[PDB]
Structure 1
Amino acid sequence: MEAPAAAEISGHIVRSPMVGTFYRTPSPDAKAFIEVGQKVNVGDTLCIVEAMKMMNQIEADKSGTVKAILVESGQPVEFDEPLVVIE
């Protein structure tokens, strides 16, 4: 009879599968892919990442709720590098 109780999910952590950059919005005066305090389901965008001289969107790989954004909009990322933390 706790947070988990059953099913169990355990927060996740988006690890830039490709070195480059990371973004949270398609623009400066644009909406945010993930609004802190929202839920995401497998198939919902979590953020973006710059690589291969082109934008690379990141779709949630496991439905969950925001947790904390380590990387910032535009901040560079590396391999096995943590980006966003989901719950």
Structure 2
Amino acid sequence: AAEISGHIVRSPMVGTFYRTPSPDAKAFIEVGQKVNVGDTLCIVEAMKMMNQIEADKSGTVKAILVESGQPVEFDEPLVVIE
């Protein structure tokens, strides 16, 4: 069964996933927070430059299939959202 996917942010490309804008900060997003259209999610460092993501239909983080800060490949779900 490959469907019913809540709302992940699979690295749109061969970039990197992130959840901390500042060194030891309050992270970008964590399971429990309810995102909302126009609400920066995480950083998609594509090539090396951050690529902040803005909600497209709100939602609620459910888990980070991907680590925190590391490279990834297209279709590589990182931040899961309900």
TM-score surpassing 0.5?
A: yes
Larger of the two Rg values belongs to structure? 1
Aligned-partner Cα distance in 2 for 1:20–1:42: 22
- Where does structure 1 differ by over 4 angstroms across 4 or more consecutive aligned residues? 6-10
Greater strand content:
1
Contact 1:24–1:72 at 8 Å: present in 2 too? no
Question: How has the CA–CA distance of structure 1 residues 20 and 7 changed in structure 2, closer, same or farther, with 3 Å as cutoff?
Answer: closer
Show CA shifts across 1:43-72 (max 9, x none): 111110111331111112221111111112
Does 2:44 match 1:49?
Answer: yes
Unaligned runs of 5+ in 2: none
Unaligned runs of 5+ in 1: 1-5
Q: What TM-score do you get using the length of structure 2 for normalisation?
A: 0.82
Aligned-partner Cα distance in 2 for 1:20–1:10: 21
Aligned-partner Cα distance in 2 for 1:17–1:52: 12
Aligned-partner Cα distance in 1 for 2:74–2:54: 17
Show CA shifts across 1:6-45 (max 9, x none): 9999721212112121100113311211132111101111
Corresponding residue pairs, total = 82
Contact 1:17–1:79 at 8 Å: present in 2 too? yes
Aligned-partner Cα distance in 2 for 1:61–1:69: 18
Question: How has the CA–CA distance of structure 1 residues 8 and 81 changed in structure 2, closer, same or farther, with 3 Å as cutoff?
Answer: closer
Identity %, equivalent residues: 100
